[PDB]
UniProtKB/Swiss-Prot annotation, chain A:
Topological relation to the membrane, as annotated: Single-pass membrane protein
Residues of the full protein shown: 68 to 285 of 285
Subunit structure: Homodimer.
Name recorded for this polypeptide: Iodotyrosine deiodinase 1
Localization terms from the record: Cell membrane; Cytoplasmic vesicle membrane
Gene Ontology annotations for the cellular component aspect, listed alphabetically: cytoplasmic vesicle membrane; nucleoplasm; plasma membrane
Outcome when changing E86Q: Loss of enzyme activity
Gene Ontology MF term list: FMN binding; iodotyrosine deiodinase activity
Residues holding 3,5-diiodo-L-tyrosine: A59, E86, K89
Chain's role: Catalyzes the dehalogenation of halotyrosines such as 3-bromo-L-tyrosine, 3-chloro-L-tyrosine, 3-iodo-L-tyrosine and 3,5-diiodo-L-tyrosine. During thyroid hormone biosynthesis, facilitates iodide salvage by catalysing the oxidative NADPH-dependent deiodination of the halogenated by-products of thyroid hormone production, monoiodotyrosine (L-MIT) and diiodotyrosine (L-DIT). The scavanged iodide can then reenter the hormone-producing pathways. Acts more efficiently on 3-iodo-L-tyrosine than 3,5-diiodo-L-tyrosine.
Catalytic activity: 2 iodide + L-tyrosine + 2 NADP(+) = 3,5-diiodo-L-tyrosine + 2 NADPH + H(+); iodide + L-tyrosine + NADP(+) = 3-iodo-L-tyrosine + NADPH; 3-iodo-L-tyrosine + iodide + NADP(+) = 3,5-diiodo-L-tyrosine + NADPH + H(+); L-tyrosine + chloride + NADP(+) = 3-chloro-L-tyrosine + NADPH
Family: Belongs to the nitroreductase family.
């Protein structure tokens, strides 16, 4: 039931270096809302989901379902509902792949952490997306997509290469001194 | 306001390879509840937090605060409250560093995603932890730690090297076919 645990320990210098570079890698990440229609490899899609599946989960429930949508039609019907639920865009059609993460009713925290791992894994693999969380369209998408009662939509990520013409907003990230407080 | 966006595109082969290896790296991760007292570099601690700070955030609120506790005393007082809130362990003392992530009142999803990035970054840097989320001790820790009204505790992660004697439970992860469903037709 409890086995010894096998670690890979790096010399402090390399721990600094590995952590620096990883930071450098992720900081290049930006939500991209202009996504090419260009095929992306299914092996990479699978790999990032495998990555996301390595998340910790409250009580080890591993309560996540990763729904991969590729059918152009399905993607459009998804687009329609989302847009409909206001009620007071294009990437959902142009992206090659939709990944919707449903949680299986702490679960929400696990799943979202899993989404975090998913995001890192795309960045690390040369793909972009724009995280979104249309919880108001959740129900109708549960039904459209055939998901069972016990799944509720959490995150919807359109995945692909950026458009040759893509742009992002000129936004700056908080510096470290603005997000980290040390107790002495 | 809107600048062109600069991408690094890898040839498909390398995208496969990079994504495989990253998967291999993260899959080595396991919550470890036996943590050595051995100093860990502050530069690595800072780096993983910087990484966690790169998360996406609803409306770009970036609403996370990363409280680093190192004082042995402070860590103990934190331990006491947590244990007290049942009311029907040791790693919080033995770990060199506590990282508590508070959210600043979608925020909860952003922050948790950020925690995900934090977890990857520790794994990637040779450190372990055991994710936990003592929301019942949140209030008393807000006060103990001096955090302001608008912060609520979310995640508490004790960080360190595993114990020379550490063990984990023999748990298997769902295979891909168990967490991934493809829509065709
Ligand atoms: C939201 C959340 C809360 C958790 N709370 C605790 C906890 O209170 N105590 C604990 O030992 N582990 C806690 N964990 C860790 C899980 O028990 C651990 O991730 C699970 O056993 C899966 O094991 P693994 O992380 O090695 O894959 C929590 C994990 C998550 C995602
Ligand atoms: C929980 C969550 C929900 C989000 N929802 C949307 C959304 O509905 N539309 C959108 O364009 N971006 C959405 N985003 C992306 C954020 O707007 C984006 O991350 C933020 O502008 C920061 O920019 P960056 O990711 O490039 O750092 C969401 C992000 C998070 C974390």
């Amino acid at each position: 039931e409890h086995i010894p645990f096998s670690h890979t320990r790096y010399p402090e210098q390399e721990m600094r270096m590995r952590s620096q570079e990883f930071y450098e890698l992720l900081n290049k990440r930006r939500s991209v809302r202009f996504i090419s229609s260009e095929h992306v490899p299914m092996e990479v899609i699978e790999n990032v989901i495998k990555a996301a599946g390595t998340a910790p989960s409250g009580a080890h429930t591993e309560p996540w379902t990763f729904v991969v949508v590729k059918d152009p039609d399905m993607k459009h019907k998804i687009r329609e509902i989302i847009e409909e639920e206001e009620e007071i865009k294009e990437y959902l059609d142009t992206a090659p792949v939709l990944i919707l993460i449903f949680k299986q009713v702490y679960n929400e925290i696990s799943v979202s952490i899993a989404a975090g791992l998913l995001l890192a894994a795309l960045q690390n693999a040369g793909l972009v997306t724009v995280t979104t969380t249309p919880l108001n369209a959740g129900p109708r998408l549960r039904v459209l997509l055939g998901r069972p009662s016990h799944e509720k939509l959490l995150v919807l990520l359109p995945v692909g290469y950026p458009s040759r013409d893509a742009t992002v907003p000129d936004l700056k990230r908080k510096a470290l001194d603005q997000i980290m407080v040390t107790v002495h």
